[PDB]
């Protein structure tokens, strides 16, 4: 999962960071190396909204050669994928809990980015959502 970042340089001296897929994700930085650092921070934050608002996260547009991009950590990507599966199944958070066999408290923090992600918990949650989470390559 790699989000292409658009960086439009502003004449004021530096660059302005945009993401064609994530409208909330907006920041900038004054140099190329610095602007990409802010890009990761800005995008990961913008994700919080969708978990809060229980709405689908737009997956990245496919990469074109020479694109700048931010590679999202697997810890974030797993629950980004988890959120989307939860919504389109239309299952309740409580109904998911019975199928998982865990109480609401630990199902909740699956749908939040500000805690450690235990990948097996995400995989198990995906299974109950009728989805299949797997790892490839390496």
């Amino acid at each position: 999962m790699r989000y292409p970042v658009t960086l439009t340089p502003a004449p004021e001296g530096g660059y302005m960071v945009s993401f064609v897929d994530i409208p909330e994700a907006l920041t900038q930085g004054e140099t190329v190396a610095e602007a990409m650092e802010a890009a990761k921070d800005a995008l990961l934050t913008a994700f919080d909204f969708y978990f809060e608002d229980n709405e689908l996260i737009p997956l990245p547009s496919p990469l074109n050669s020479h694109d700048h991009f931010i590679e999202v950590p697997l810890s974030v990507a797993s629950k980004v994928l988890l959120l989307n599966a939860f919504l389109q199944s239309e299952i309740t958070q409580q109904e998911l809990a019975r199928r998982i066999g865990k109480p609401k408290q630990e199902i909740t923090r699956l749908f939040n980015l500000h805690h450690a992600t235990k990948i097996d918990a995400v995989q198990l949650a995906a299974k109950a959502l009728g989805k299949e989470l797997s790892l490839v390559m390496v």
């Binding site: 439009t8 502003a10 004021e12 530096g14 302005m16 945009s18 409208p23 909330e24 994700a25 907006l26 920041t27 900038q28 004054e30 802010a38 921070d41 800005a42 990961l44 934050t45 913008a46 919080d48 909204f49 608002d53 500000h114």
Partner: protein
């Protein structure tokens, strides 16, 4: 930046980038008060928060 964080838009929960929501509309931006905030940021942000 004193102007940006003011009337209308709600600055709620967050840690790094601020999460500002305005009656169903959403946008982030850096906090870093001493750096100069760019105009293209302000236009993207005001446009993100005032169109559907």
């Amino acid at each position: 930046r004193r102007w940006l964080e003011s009337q209308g838009v709600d600055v709620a929960n967050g840690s790094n980038h601020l999460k500002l929501r305005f009656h169903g509309r959403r946008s982030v931006m850096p906090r870093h008060p001493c750096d100069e905030i760019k105009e293209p940021l302000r236009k993207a942000i005001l446009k993100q928060l005032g169109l559907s």
